[PDB]
Amino acid sequence: XXXXXXXXXXXXXXXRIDLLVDKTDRLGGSAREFR
Amino acid sequence: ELLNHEPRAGRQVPLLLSMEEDELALDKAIESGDTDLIYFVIHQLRRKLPLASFFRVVSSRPTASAMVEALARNSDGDGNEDTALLKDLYYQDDRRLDGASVFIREALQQPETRTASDKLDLAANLLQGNQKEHVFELGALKEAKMLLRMQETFERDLTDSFVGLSVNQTMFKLIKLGYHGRAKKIQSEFKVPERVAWWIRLQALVA
Amino acid sequence: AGFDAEQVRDKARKDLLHLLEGVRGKKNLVIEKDLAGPLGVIVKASTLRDYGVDNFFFLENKNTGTSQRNIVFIARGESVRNAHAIAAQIKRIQRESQTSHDFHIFWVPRRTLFSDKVLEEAGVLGDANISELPLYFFPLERDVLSLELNDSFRDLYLAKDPTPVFLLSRALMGIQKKHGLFPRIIGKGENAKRVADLLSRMRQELLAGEEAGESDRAGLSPSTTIESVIIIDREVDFVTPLLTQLTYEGLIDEYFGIQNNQTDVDAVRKRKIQLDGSDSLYSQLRDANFAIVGSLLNTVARRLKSDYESRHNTKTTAELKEFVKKLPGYQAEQQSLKIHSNIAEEIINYTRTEIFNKLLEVQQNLAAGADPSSQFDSIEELVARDTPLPQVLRLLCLYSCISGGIKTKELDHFRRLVLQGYGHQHLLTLHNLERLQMFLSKSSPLASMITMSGSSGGPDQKTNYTYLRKQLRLIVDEVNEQDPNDIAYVYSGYAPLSIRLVQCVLQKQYLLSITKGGGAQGWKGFEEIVKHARGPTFDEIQKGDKKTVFVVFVGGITFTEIAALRFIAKQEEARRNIVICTTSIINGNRMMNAAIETATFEKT
């Protein structure tokens, strides 16, 4: 129970990460030469 | 035979001018690189000499002329000019391009197309003597005078802004407003390249 | 005991504040705009208020508030305009006042005679407590010192103003006064030689003083913590800054424009982004080729996300108590990544446009050595599509500088395109480019490159890029951008001549290897090659473990050149500490803006 409470507090604090990495990949995923 | 070991190549110059050794003082200020020392010699020489003798001294030495010329285009500072000094400097040095550019620069300050074209006329007047070498610039000036007239015409007929736009920009506005009859006149008149005109024409219609 | 960039920052801050003490009581501040920026690098605006500053005002605004009584001016003293601007403001308050006010002026770096005459022929010279603020190098990074003279390129190459050359000499001399004489002064270019000449003239003037009982105790001997100073004149290699820069920081400067380690953006008026080596992310991103920025940005987002998830393990107080501690360091990295993404994403949409690719295509073709005439139709199409004037002018200058002038027939077509495409006002713009010798006819003696075939002739004959392309391996079609093995990665296959010349001095073995310590220093072994670059080649000598090396750029340096230089600094990390100095941070657009007439033939 104590453990559960601790986990909850962390979660509240956190409330982008999930939908940020994907942002980046689309940009990357095209060409690798300015030529 | 010996401006010698003494002293600090830096105040052997007022010494030099005290001994009325003109140009030697100037040269030492130029060699020093110190723009303050250079101005000092230039300002004294101006107060001392007839401008024509002053002009001859400073024109032999690029850095000197350069600074005189800068100050002539910055006496407010920025914007305002000492245009009289510049015209005289360039005339006594046969710097016909630089002298013509002064009138051109003035045409860009005229609130009316008629005055601006007048300044452009003066610009050309300097250039017709030679003629050769200035073939391009004379042509460019003649072009500008024509486009300005045609653009005020457009302003009067079509009731919109046109004066001041570039040749390309004028076609664009004419085409975007559906006046293809006028826009084709510009193209034929100023011999606008095919690839350019096709490109302009395309960009205009989509707008 | 060697050179540390922080002591420059500290002295700069200490000299400014020591003058603020000098003005007793609280004070209102008036700063030259293009000086406010650089100042923010040496002092906090926070710190300034504590020393008694109430409100901040820009000098060029003509709206100084009468709030506090004391009015303090800080402006560069070499500026003719700045003198007039302050003088105008000193009257805009003697005839609109309510009190008398005491006026203090801090000239950077010195009070000049001209300044006084402008102030004198307005009468206001007498009511002015004028002090000097010896600011020279602004330390932008630990390895980058810059005078931050933004108009230095116009001043030097158009106006023919020796002030930037003069100041830089003084700045460098300051380094000598504290850490000892440069053992060697190695350089290339007319204004590089001028800097060296001013360094020897100033040295002697210190000895004329000490000999003649001016004292100063001593008395400079060759340094023990400095290997040498290498001085490059920008006018030796105009091509590199003309090219569109392809590193991350380069493209930011190319598109957003970076001033004083800062810039403005719209996507989280606009907001001011800090761009310096503090941000741990930007440090790694800035010097990288823009291609791999995505790959690098993702790898960090991919690692950040699996660093937030992590450490929910030992779910008892401690291993969570320790996690919330290291928590503000996550949010910063999270907000940094979103900024440098949005920015990256915006630079990307720009590089995908047909115009950009058309520009790069022409730049690359010309640099590679293709027949410039083959790029004509492409340039003409670009003008027809109304691409920004600076980009077109950069191509024409790149065209002209790489082909030893422009053919008479093609020249006239180019002048017609610029004029009829952007305005006849640019009859002046082309004339300025002609004085800068970056857009010339082939029939001009100034357009000629240096050859050991066409006899002598030409005192100021230009850099032979055709010769130097081969001899110095200016083109590297190898170089992988994910893990660069040469400085040519900053232009995706082109190594900058300027940095390549530095390598003629610093990395002789490597430079020999790609064309098949202690000594021998200097240009030794590359004399014939460097002979083919514009201007004088020199190496003056003035009379244990790792020492510092100053690479000095007279007339501007680019972010591409800084990164390339940093790449070398790493390779030499063992035996050398490389410190970059420059008059300003320059780029193609700043260069062009120097020549471009803004008047307009329109309605007033």
UniProtKB/TrEMBL annotation, chain A:
It comes from Chaetomium thermophilum (strain DSM 1495 / CBS 144.50 / IMI 039719). This is Synaptobrevin homolog YKT6. Belongs to the synaptobrevin family. It comes from the Eukaryota. The chain holds residues 183 to 202 of 242 of the full protein. The lineage of its organism: Eukaryota, Fungi, Dikarya, Ascomycota, Pezizomycotina. It is found in: Endomembrane system.
From TrEMBL, chain C:
This is Small conjugating protein ligase-like protein. One of its GO terms (molecular function) is ligase activity. One of its GO terms (biological process) is vesicle-mediated transport. Belongs to the STXBP/unc-18/SEC1 family. The lineage of its organism: Eukaryota, Fungi, Dikarya, Ascomycota, Pezizomycotina. The chain holds residues 144 to 798 of 806 of the full protein. Keywords: Ligase.
